[PDB]
Design a protein around this ligand. Structure first.
Ligand SMILES: Cc1cc2c3c(c1C)C(C)(C)C[C@H]1C[C@@H](C)[C@]4(C(=O)NC(=O)N=C4N2C[C@H](O)[C@H](O)[C@H](O)COP(=O)(O)O)N31
Ligand SMILES: Cc1cc2c3c(c1C)C(C)(C)C[C@H]1C[C@@H](C)[C@]4(C(=O)NC(=O)N=C4N2C[C@H](O)[C@H](O)[C@H](O)COP(=O)(O)O)N31
Ligand SMILES: [K+]
Ligand SMILES: [K+]
Ligand SMILES: [K+]
Ligand SMILES: [K+]
Ligand SMILES: [Mn+2]
Ligand SMILES: [Mn+2]
Lengths: 497, 496
């Protein structure tokens, strides 16, 4: 099924009329990404480049915008829903609820198969030349060809028991090497550091492109420390992921992956990495920074293999539909397990994946007999001292009349219920996400502080209750008047609602 | 008369643009008219003209809802505002604000007096007036009365006779012959009321003109300077005089083609319960009235087939967001320029609910000052937040000249990615605070003081050596040769 096979998923998008088959030659040097970028900025159909200039022996086609938005408001999240066995009409809440569903139920462990489509073709050792493959130039000022924007890194702990799946960028650095981000507090870096501590120079690693869509979603989600994503993915799907062992190492990859790289992640060697047009909408031309080296020793791939590509940057791409939103999901769960009265969380698109809005159960809040200043500090202390809060710099607390999945409602609440400064608690001492330009290119420490909890609950919401009515059609007119207007609307000559 | 100089011409201009629905079915002024208008404003539909208002008698009145709300077509979004000002329907928000500022720098065109006009076609006087029997709208179900006055022009003159102010301030029917309405500091209607109070005048000559020339209602919502009569400013915008007729029962003058004029007095002593009212920030507080001054109405004159304009204000988007914060932003821009600050442009992002202004910085000029965001933000706030034009604005966002301040998406992108919360903000605890905002009147600190911020959304290098990034967008991250190959293939390949 589509959630368990990238190839099935591609056909599901084609069946939905959410995919353009581009059969004309497209240059992987900027042209494919430029098409993808414009799809993302216009919420168009996903582009499938079936004729990439420089492709050879089945490597490769490219799918752009694999989890970007559709333009129909009723199926806006449909391409995300097709990762997860949900209907194209699924809400953002439906998607986040499904991704959280595995945190309260036993894992469904993966099953092993002896082969699969990912073994249909191979290139090994000296025959590998990554600079001769059609890796895309994703933005004109990038420091290299970002082959890795939507694949899953596979890496296992020294005791063999924790295998982490995650997305982190990587670019081609040479004939047999990539360089890519391995940053604190991410699990790929935690495991890298476990190996470094016991003296391992080259860690077994694999990078799988075009994995089962449920697996790429979990790869982007900050599920708990020491939890192998494979079993979590199985529990989301209600059935196991079928894995096949790598040929050159003891790691396992999904048997129907499009393309797998087998090799090592170094503890000892770094190489210039970046710059890269990133999730906040910026590239800094000429600004590389050292990152770890991955060495590729074998490539295996499906016939007619497809490389997925996120041309990330300004709204709206995978970095905002998945990174911020899946962090929001985990922040919601963390707040609930801290005892805070949070029902829902989302990462508003306007915040460029740096904001999370938290919806408060105000009945429960009133029973907890607190106040905004105390509550805002407690929420920040809970969230900003945990990994799931790392990338988020502004938390907005809103009452339960605000739809946190609607950026218009969040902005209205923020602008009219949070007195600037007075109703905010600032956090100078917590880990800060250096990739945001106001952090690495700003006025204070790149890696520390710069966070805020904004209390956008009005004072009476903590005590006696909501005492206003919205000046809107829904709340300032009685049902009898609303029904009269809706029944007259089109006859009078107004646009269908 | 052209649409910018006649409300009646303006209504026909909207009809000609396909921007007006003639509602000939009966509509109740008790909530139904405002509910229709509210839904038009929430969906950017055509302006509703209620030609059959239940309880209308002897020509009073028709209602026009949503007179300056938005159109749904992106290319003509501000078209209803542009029709106020002799601009094309495709006019940008910047074209509109620039036109409103245009009279700052040219001599006023003084009004001309005419002996009569359409506004004198009908009258009701003295004890024949019963404001409670007129079809004044109930605009929101929890309002404290019928807000007859949401889009008319108060006319009031200083004791020395030299300053005649035109402004919009809400008022509701409060009795057979009385309105009650907001007369708040620091507004010019209150400054003038206080000048009369100080010399012992009990009843100040006043008029309220409904359906004034559209250029006049736009100036009525603009904070032009203390002591400057809006009439000559309006003439300078329109490129010719507004024709005024003297009131019958006092010495004030009103536009000769107004739809409806109330003549009477504003009391310096008498108060009555006023509000609550569903207001510009999207809220009404049921039961929360506060004493406000009394207006006494002694004569009504009106046009045949008179139209009462109505703003059913509240959540986005209505006249309070298209006019109040935007025209304040225009004046804040010029205030900053007179202070010698390097500001080129300003707008009130719709997302801010008329409490935000984004200021566009000339970064070349900024770099010449060799300053920093922390120092600059404090200076900008010290200028803006102690002036009347800054009163209603609680958050200024400073952005560089790669940000379109007229585009909420660009403003939010800059705010979210270039202003480090707290670190890059200067808070103002001691300045006048706009109590109408819920987080002020119904919040955790003084209702009338503080709660303001300047947010520095310029990146650090913008102050020193210059912009050192490029946007990760189609426009900026791909060469023109590639952009053109894509745009030339786009529809052929199957994209929208
Ligand atoms: C959906 C997505 C997720 C990304 C990234 C991207 C996309 C599309 C691309 C590659 C386009 C851009 C960069 C941007 C960059 C943030 C980063 C990365 O290079 N480094 C990083 O550490 N985390 C990244 N994530 C987030 C990451 O997958 C999650 O944080 C996940 O929880 C980690 O899994 P573990 O919890 O198991 O540790 N990239
Ligand atoms: C376009 C508009 C402008 C409004 C209001 C409204 C509309 C539609 C309504 C009536 C719907 C809602 C209230 C909301 C409320 C803010 C107020 C008001 O009741 N009191 C006030 O003092 N200012 C208002 N203004 C702004 C005012 O016109 C400008 O500030 C103008 O510069 C004043 O002229 P002077 O500079 O010459 O002093 N009203
Ligand atoms: K993960
Ligand atoms: K608050
Ligand atoms: K005015
Ligand atoms: K800044
Ligand atoms: Mn993990
Ligand atoms: Mn004035």
């Amino acid at each position: 099924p589509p959630h368990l096979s990238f190839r099935s998923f591609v056909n599901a998008l084609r069946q939905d009329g959410d995919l353009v088959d581009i059969n004309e030659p497209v240059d992987p040097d900027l042209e494919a990404a430029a098409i993808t970028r414009l799809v993302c900025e216009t919420d168009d159909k996903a582009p499938l480049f079936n004729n990439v200039i420089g492709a050879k022996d089945g490597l490769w086609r490219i799918l752009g915008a694999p989890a970007s938005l559709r333009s129909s408001p009723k199926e806006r999240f449909g391409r995300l829903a097709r990762h997860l066995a949900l209907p194209p009409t699924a809400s953002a809440k439906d998607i986040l609820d499904k991704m959280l569903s595995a945190n309260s139920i036993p894992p469904i462990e993966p099953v092993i198969v002896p082969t699969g489509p990912v073994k249909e073709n191979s290139i090994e050792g000296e025959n590998i030349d990554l600079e001769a493959l059609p890796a895309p130039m994703v933005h004109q000022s990038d420091g290299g060809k970002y082959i890795q924007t939507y694949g899953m890194h596979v890496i296992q702990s020294p005791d063999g028991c924790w295998t982490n799946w995650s997305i982190a960028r990587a670019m081609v650095s040479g004939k047999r090497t990539l360089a890519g981000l391995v940053i604190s507090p991410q699990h790929i870096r935690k495991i890298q550091d476990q190996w470094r501590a016991i003296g391992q120079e080259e860690i077994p690693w694999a990078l799988a492109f075009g994995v089962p869509p449920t697996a790429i979603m979990a790869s982007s989600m900050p599920i708990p420390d020491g939890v192998s994503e494979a079993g979590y993915v199985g529990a989301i799907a209600g059935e196991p992921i079928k894995l096949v062992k790598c040929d050159t190492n003891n790691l396992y990859v999904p048997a129907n992956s499009e393309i797998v790289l087998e090799g090592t992640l170094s503890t000892t060697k770094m190489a210039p990495e970046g710059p890269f047009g990133e999730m906040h909408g910026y590239v800094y031309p000429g600004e590389s920074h050292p990152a770890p080296v991955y060495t590729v020793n074998k490539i295996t791939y499906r016939n007619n293999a497809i490389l997925p590509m996120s041309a990330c940057g300004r709204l709206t791409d995978e970095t905002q539909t998945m990174i911020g939103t899946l962090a929001a999901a985990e922040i919601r769960q963390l707040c609930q397990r801290a005892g805070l009265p949070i029902t829902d969380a989302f990462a508003p698109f306007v915040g460029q994946a740096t904001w999370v809005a938290l919806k408060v159960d105000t009945h429960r809040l009133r029973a907890m007999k607190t106040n905004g200043k105390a509550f805002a500090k407690r929420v920040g202390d809970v969230v900003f001292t945990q990994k799931v809060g790392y990338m988020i710099h502004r938390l907005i607390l809103v009452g339960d009349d605000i739809d946190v999945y609607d950026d218009k409602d969040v902005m209205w609440a923020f602008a009219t219920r949070c007195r600037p400064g007075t109703d905010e608690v600032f956090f100078d001492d917590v880990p800060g996400f250096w990739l945001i330009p106001y952090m690495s290119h700003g006025n204070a420490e790149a890696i520390k502080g710069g966070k805020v909890v904004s209390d956008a609950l009005l004072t009476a919401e903590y005590t006696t209750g909501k005492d206003w009515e919205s000046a809107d059609f829904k709340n300032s007119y009685p049902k009898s008047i609303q029904d009269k207007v809706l029944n007259s609307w089109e006859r009078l000559g107004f646009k269908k609602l």
